[PDB]
Amino acid sequence: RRITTTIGLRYEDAAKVGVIVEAVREMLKNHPAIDQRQTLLVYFNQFADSSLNIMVYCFTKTTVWAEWLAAQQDVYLKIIDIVQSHGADFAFPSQTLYMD
Amino acid sequence: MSRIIKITIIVVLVLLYGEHFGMSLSGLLTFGGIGGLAVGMAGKDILSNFFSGIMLYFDRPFSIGDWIRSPDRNIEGTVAEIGWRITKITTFDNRPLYVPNSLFSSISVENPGRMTNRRITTTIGLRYEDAAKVGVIVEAVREMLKNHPAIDQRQTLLVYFNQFADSSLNIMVYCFTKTTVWAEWLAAQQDVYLKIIDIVQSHGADFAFPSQTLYMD
Numbered sequence: 099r100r101i102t103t104t105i106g107l108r109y110e111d112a113a114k115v116g117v118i119v120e121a122v123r124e125m126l127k128n129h130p131a132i133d134q135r136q137t138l139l140v141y142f143n144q145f146a147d148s149s150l151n152i153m154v155y156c157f158t159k160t161t162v163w164a165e166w167l168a169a170q171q172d173v174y175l176k177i178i179d180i181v182q183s184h185g186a187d188f189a190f191p192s193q194t195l196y197m198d
Numbered sequence: 199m200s201r202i203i204k205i206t207i208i209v210v211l212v213l214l215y216g217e218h219f220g221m222s223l224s225g226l227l228t229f230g231g232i233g234g235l236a237v238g239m240a241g242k243d244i245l246s247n248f249f250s251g252i253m254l255y256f257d258r259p260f261s262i263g264d265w266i267r268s269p270d271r272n273i274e275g276t277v278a279e280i281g282w283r284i285t286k287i288t289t290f291d292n293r294p295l296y297v298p299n300s301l302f303s304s305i306s307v308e309n310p311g312r313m314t315n316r317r318i319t320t321t322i323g324l325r326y327e328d329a330a331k332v333g334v335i336v337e338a339v340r341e342m343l344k345n346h347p348a349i350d351q352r353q354t355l356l357v358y359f360n361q362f363a364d365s366s367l368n369i370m371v372y373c374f375t376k377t378t379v380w381a382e383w384l385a386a387q388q389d390v391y392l393k394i395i396d397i398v399q400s401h402g403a404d405f406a407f408p409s410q411t412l413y414m415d
Contacts (some may be wrong), residue, residue: 100291109405112395119388136292141384142391145320147408157292194365194409 099158099166101173106149111186115142119152121180126156129176131169133157149189209233243300244283250299251282259302264311271305273297315350315374316383318390323366328403332359336369338397343373346393348386350374366406 105122107115123140126132136157144151154177158169181188212220213230220226258280260266265276266287275295279286284296322339324332340357343349353374361368371394375386398405 112392112399116392137380139381139384142388143384145322145391145405192407194407196409196411198411198413 099161101156101158101170103154105152105154105177105181106146106189107152107186108189109150112150114184114186115150115152118181118184118186121184122154122177125176125180129173131158133159148192246300247283247298250303254280254299254302259307260309264309267308267310268305271301313378315353316378318373318375318387320371322369322371322394322398323363323406324369324403325406326367329367331401331403332367332369335398335401335403338401339371339394342393342397346390348375350376365409
């Protein structure tokens with residue numbers, strides 16, 4: 099079963115992307131539920147409208163629905179902790195407003 | 199199934215030997231013609247799949263292990279098996295997909311597994327107030343792309359300001375890498391993007407968010 103997601107950081111977090119990517123990759127290489135013989139990619143690869151996007155792309159050992167969902171939830175929570183511990187944050191849709 | 203074969207063989211034998219104890223040639227011709235017309239129109243797709251399987255056996259654009267694609271249908275994945283009726287392809291979420299062979303006789307097939315380079319394309323959107331810097335920024339970016347060891351200098355390399363967007367001035371970036379490996383290409387792209395961010399921010403410009411002008415009552 100495949101786990102794919104996108105981490106959208108703020109444009110003001112551009113100085114942390116590198117280390118954050120490394121951290122996430124390291125976590126995915128130590129998680130017991132992740133199949134280490136399959137594709138495992140964590141890279142900054144997109145300039146979005148409001149965020150810098152980091153792709154996460156991995157596989158789980160199990161094929162059961164509930165176990166895969168639980169592993170995905172655990173990975174997502176760990177990703178949130180990693181992002182917030184480095185001083186970055188997730189980006190909302192953003193706009194620049196010019197007033198009369 | 200045995201009964202079906204029984205009835206089919208009885209019909210075929212009656213049609214073939216229907217003269218020694220048989221009857222009207224017009225009637226037998228009409229009966230057999232109706233039956234054969236129905237059978238031929240009904241069995242067209244299976245026979246088409248097998249004919250395309252023979253064609254693939256003799257002239258095949260791909261091989262086992264090739265990543266293939268199509269702009270007409272969804273057949274993306276890596277070829278795992280080529281059969282006489284269907285082709286088995288492993289998708290990128292590790293699922294088997296069974297493509298009927300006749301599709302390969304009517305759609306365009308792309309073979310990314312035989313690519314020579316990986317392409318890096320992106321757009322740098324600067325603020326409209328940065329219009330006085332675009333020029334130098336473009337030059338800077340181009341210079342970096344001509345000194346990066348991961349970039350193929352014998353391929354297309356374009357960096358130009360080419361679009362008035364709604365909220366930004368757009369600069370196209372279009373180049374190729376030497377490697378065709380997935381992870382190495384992604385790492386090179388990440389390095390190039392970080393260098394682009396540094397170049398843009400060191401010249402006093404910035405990336406543009408979607409912008410609006412608001413008039414209040």
